[PDB]
Design a protein around this ligand. Sequence first.
Ligand SMILES: CC(C)CCC[C@@H](C)CCC[C@@H](C)CCC[C@@H](C)CCOC[C@@H](CO[C@H]1O[C@H](CO)[C@@H](O)[C@H](O)[C@H]1O[C@H]1O[C@H](CO[C@@H]2O[C@H](CO)[C@H](O)[C@H](OS(=O)(=O)O)[C@H]2O)[C@@H](O)[C@H](O)[C@@H]1O)OCC[C@H](C)CCC[C@H](C)CCC[C@H](C)CCCC(C)C
Ligand SMILES: CC(C)CCC[C@@H](C)CCC[C@@H](C)CCC[C@@H](C)CCOC[C@@H](CO[C@H]1O[C@H](CO)[C@@H](O)[C@H](O)[C@H]1O[C@H]1O[C@H](CO[C@@H]2O[C@H](CO)[C@H](O)[C@H](OS(=O)(=O)O)[C@H]2O)[C@@H](O)[C@H](O)[C@@H]1O)OCC[C@H](C)CCC[C@H](C)CCC[C@H](C)CCCC(C)C
Ligand SMILES: CC(C)CCC[C@@H](C)CCC[C@@H](C)CCC[C@@H](C)CCOC[C@@H](CO[C@H]1O[C@H](CO)[C@@H](O)[C@H](O)[C@H]1O[C@H]1O[C@H](CO[C@@H]2O[C@H](CO)[C@H](O)[C@H](OS(=O)(=O)O)[C@H]2O)[C@@H](O)[C@H](O)[C@@H]1O)OCC[C@H](C)CCC[C@H](C)CCC[C@H](C)CCCC(C)C
Ligand SMILES: *C/C=C(C)/C=C/C=C(C)/C=C/C1=C(C)CCCC1(C)C
Ligand SMILES: *C/C=C(C)/C=C/C=C(C)/C=C/C1=C(C)CCCC1(C)C
Ligand SMILES: *C/C=C(C)/C=C/C=C(C)/C=C/C1=C(C)CCCC1(C)C
Ligand SMILES: CCCCCCCCS[C@@H]1O[C@H](CO)[C@@H](O)[C@H](O)[C@H]1O
Ligand SMILES: CCCCCCCCS[C@@H]1O[C@H](CO)[C@@H](O)[C@H](O)[C@H]1O
Ligand SMILES: CCCCCCCCS[C@@H]1O[C@H](CO)[C@@H](O)[C@H](O)[C@H]1O
Lengths: 228, 228, 228
Amino acid sequence: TGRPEWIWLALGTALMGLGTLYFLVKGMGVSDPDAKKFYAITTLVPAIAFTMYLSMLLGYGLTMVPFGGEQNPIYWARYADWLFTTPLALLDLALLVDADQGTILALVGADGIMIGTGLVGALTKVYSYRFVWWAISTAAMLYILYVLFFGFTSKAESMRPEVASTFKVLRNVTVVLWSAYPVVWLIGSEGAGIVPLNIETLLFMVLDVSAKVGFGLILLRSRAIFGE
Amino acid sequence: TGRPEWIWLALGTALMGLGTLYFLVKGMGVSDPDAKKFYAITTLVPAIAFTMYLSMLLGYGLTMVPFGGEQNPIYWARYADWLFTTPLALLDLALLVDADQGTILALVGADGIMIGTGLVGALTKVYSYRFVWWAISTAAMLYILYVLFFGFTSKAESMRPEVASTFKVLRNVTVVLWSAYPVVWLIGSEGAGIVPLNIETLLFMVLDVSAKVGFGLILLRSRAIFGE
Amino acid sequence: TGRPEWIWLALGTALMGLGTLYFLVKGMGVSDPDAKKFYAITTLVPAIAFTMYLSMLLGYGLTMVPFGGEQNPIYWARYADWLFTTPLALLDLALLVDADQGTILALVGADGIMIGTGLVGALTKVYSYRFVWWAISTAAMLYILYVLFFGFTSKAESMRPEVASTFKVLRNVTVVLWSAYPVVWLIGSEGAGIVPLNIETLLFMVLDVSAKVGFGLILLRSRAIFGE
Ligand SMILES: CC(C)CCC[C@@H](C)CCC[C@@H](C)CCC[C@@H](C)CCOC[C@@H](CO[C@H]1O[C@H](CO)[C@@H](O)[C@H](O)[C@H]1O[C@H]1O[C@H](CO[C@@H]2O[C@H](CO)[C@H](O)[C@H](OS(=O)(=O)O)[C@H]2O)[C@@H](O)[C@H](O)[C@@H]1O)OCC[C@H](C)CCC[C@H](C)CCC[C@H](C)CCCC(C)C
Ligand SMILES: CC(C)CCC[C@@H](C)CCC[C@@H](C)CCC[C@@H](C)CCOC[C@@H](CO[C@H]1O[C@H](CO)[C@@H](O)[C@H](O)[C@H]1O[C@H]1O[C@H](CO[C@@H]2O[C@H](CO)[C@H](O)[C@H](OS(=O)(=O)O)[C@H]2O)[C@@H](O)[C@H](O)[C@@H]1O)OCC[C@H](C)CCC[C@H](C)CCC[C@H](C)CCCC(C)C
Ligand SMILES: CC(C)CCC[C@@H](C)CCC[C@@H](C)CCC[C@@H](C)CCOC[C@@H](CO[C@H]1O[C@H](CO)[C@@H](O)[C@H](O)[C@H]1O[C@H]1O[C@H](CO[C@@H]2O[C@H](CO)[C@H](O)[C@H](OS(=O)(=O)O)[C@H]2O)[C@@H](O)[C@H](O)[C@@H]1O)OCC[C@H](C)CCC[C@H](C)CCC[C@H](C)CCCC(C)C
Ligand SMILES: *C/C=C(C)/C=C/C=C(C)/C=C/C1=C(C)CCCC1(C)C
Ligand SMILES: *C/C=C(C)/C=C/C=C(C)/C=C/C1=C(C)CCCC1(C)C
Ligand SMILES: *C/C=C(C)/C=C/C=C(C)/C=C/C1=C(C)CCCC1(C)C
Ligand SMILES: CCCCCCCCS[C@@H]1O[C@H](CO)[C@@H](O)[C@H](O)[C@H]1O
Ligand SMILES: CCCCCCCCS[C@@H]1O[C@H](CO)[C@@H](O)[C@H](O)[C@H]1O
Ligand SMILES: CCCCCCCCS[C@@H]1O[C@H](CO)[C@@H](O)[C@H](O)[C@H]1O
């Protein structure tokens, strides 16, 4: 349909779409109030992802940013997505572990700064400044990952085995997947064009589908979502 | 003052404005913590509506979108309004019925997607794509209306008669009024210019004032807002 | 680095930055769940402030708005900041006083309208309309300050002496500092160029650092954050 990345944008749209329908069907009939929350948070994530990928496929989520002299194609839609989508995931983890409201707020705020800053960076005209924002964004992410890995884990150890083990898997998955985004951003169209928009869109696609559908699958198929 | 719809924008500004002052006065002195919530949610709704209509009257909430060849006047302010305003209404219904947090979250998310998608649609350059977004938006709305009509009603039947009956009226009103927006959008300046911006603004005005002031009146005048 | 206000933007960036690090260090090791909330809300405030000042220093948070004929430099970043930052402060006050959810919602909404309206005003092309938005914004602020001064105080009197006294100081500080913003706006680049962007940025800088770091200091150093 034009841009060479369109295909990956198309597959992501479809996969996020199918992931949503699958979770909607699976959560059908669930009466446990605690399970309801998990199904609602986890299903909304890909749902949002669906709408944003579609805006990128249709060309809407793409804008033009000048820097480095030449012209640059920046998909701003990703930030619109991640803005609500990363915190929701954090909410799933927090509920699983029964995190204190104080830490949930700190984590959501750090997330908002992470994405807000990432977005600013992506739209900054002075090529050199874009990295400053990257550094601030990455620092916010490391703060989140630090709390998830050391703070939540400890909270998870006070739960029953099924809950503790599922949190462990989800924790490992988010830490690994999340840390890949700033790398992809840095070596891609947003930072250094070392990697073509072509290959980047493919990476974000695998990362996103894994972080949402995959994450959703691991969580929604375990009995950890039931308070018992 | 220029555009032929200005008058309806003016009456809406005034009515939303008067509706706010009226509710502010009526909620004065209320000490019941549960009633306070209802008064706060219900009063903020028209208050937000006030500010957005004014931006449309003054020309600020109007932008220009190219599609179908010719030029199109799109009031984006409505989405800014509805973005916070539709969920608040959902919150009133949820409190009345004491809905589970899981469903409140799902409903607020579906609402966010509904408006976010509606906005995208309204600002899309490819005339044909605008309808795709309409379809997604309408699907989100039908999901909300489905849960309100069948899920909330059942929750409402566990409450005392005054609460159950008031929820019934509000439920009927929102289902009917809400379903009219996508129709108006489709046959109006946002979709097919079958209906002139002139008549459309009049429709949204009646719909909005009914959905907020009317809804506010029905709710704020019943003892259903008191937990007893 | 160009614009004459750059220096104040630089000092604000640094002070907000140092204020965040200081609070992050101070809140380290705190286990009280109630203290955690206060530290999270109070630390995020300057953190957000940091990111926005930096966007203004680097030129990103500055835009051009035509009105009064001549050209006008408007830093929109301040609203992006205040949008999340003013409510957080309100949340600190509400927790301290254990305010009803209804009033917290009303206050957050009034705040959202205050900033949203202030932003609209700042970006309006018709010089005369900018003041209409100012008036609406100021009315929302007075509503907040009224509730904080008379409503919260009363709520504060049911708490122990340390809490009541700390709320008193914070209450006095916010009322005074908050009321200065609409004055600065009115006599500055946003309204009447009586005061040069040079002196204005200096004022907002002192006001902001006082409202956040100062406020943070007064609150985070008292035992009022401990539910005991
Ligand atoms: C309502 C919604 C739910 C609120 C969501 C939160 C919101 C605050 C933030 C999302 C954050 C952030 C990522 C967005 C900000 C980034 C910013 C830089 C981009 C803004 O653009 C997005 C705007 C579109 O603007 C368009 O309209 C205006 C006015 O009419 C135009 O002035 C502007 O130019 C338009 O831009 C579009 O077109 C551009 C095209 O550029 C060129 O234009 C010329 C014509 O002039 C030619 O057509 C060129 O063609 S050619 O010659 O080159 O061939 C053409 O290139 C593009 O470049 C632009 O990219 C753009 O397409 O819209 C706002 C989007 C909304 C807010 C997204 C909704 C997202 C989703 C549904 C949200 C669900 C959220 C829900 C609330 C979660 C609930 C969670 C619960 C708690 C659980
Ligand atoms: C802070 C606030 C509380 C946050 C609210 C949430 C926010 C994320 C989203 C609202 C969602 C969504 C609907 C908005 C996105 C849609 C997007 C496409 C529109 C963006 O425009 C809105 C911007 C204005 O941009 C303007 O400034 C920039 C920078 O200076 C310009 O680049 C831009 O062009 C400007 O656009 C205005 O002017 C345009 C004029 O076009 C032409 O311009 C030329 C000059 O170049 C000539 O003047 C032309 O004249 S002529 O020749 O034709 O004769 C002229 O036509 C217009 O076309 C544009 O439409 C526009 O007027 O501002 C952002 C608005 C804010 C966010 C709205 C605040 C709303 C309300 C107060 C919110 C209350 C919320 C509260 C938080 C709820 C709490 C609830 C509790 C939980 C209970
Ligand atoms: C994701 C984030 C967390 C969501 C935050 C909430 C969000 C809904 C609202 C913030 C509210 C409000 C204040 C913003 C709306 C105001 C609006 C008018 C301004 C919009 O601009 C901001 C956009 C940038 O747009 C830029 O990109 C588009 C698309 O590519 C361009 O079309 C647009 O023009 C760009 O504008 C920038 O550049 C302009 C430059 O103008 C001229 O441009 C030419 C080239 O064309 C030349 O370069 C000129 O140079 S020269 O010749 O004159 O020499 C040049 O002047 C500037 O004028 C513009 O000002 C702008 O720089 O981005 C959106 C910003 C994001 C959303 C901010 C993130 C803020 C922070 C990190 C948020 C933390 C929030 C967290 C969620 C809190 C959690 C709290 C818990 C509950 C506790
Ligand atoms: C479903 C989407 C997910 C889980 C997205 C996660 C995204 C991130 C962890 C993004 C992080 C970034 C930085 C740390 C700095 C560079 C800019 C970003 C936004 C790519
Ligand atoms: C006070 C305002 C109210 C109750 C607004 C309700 C608005 C809707 C239910 C809008 C729905 C739409 C669709 C279903 C698709 C077409 C686009 C919209 C946003 C008009
Ligand atoms: C950390 C930042 C703080 C405490 C900011 C407070 C800002 C205000 C109270 C702003 C108020 C305004 C009006 C009342 C109308 C004029 C426009 C504003 C946004 C400057
Ligand atoms: C475009 C529409 C997007 C809709 C996103 C909604 C996510 C809904 S999850 C769903 O929420 C119900 C509460 O309504 C629970 O009862 C179910 O068990 C649970 O699975
Ligand atoms: C521009 C200003 C917009 C303000 C919107 C605020 C809606 C306030 S409702 C009001 O909230 C109080 C708590 O403060 C309760 O005590 C009252 O009973 C109730 O009626
Ligand atoms: C760019 C990163 C911005 C991060 C902002 C986070 C504010 C964190 S406050 C911190 O939150 C912890 C919970 O994680 C509590 O345990 C600590 O006692 C408290 O002091």
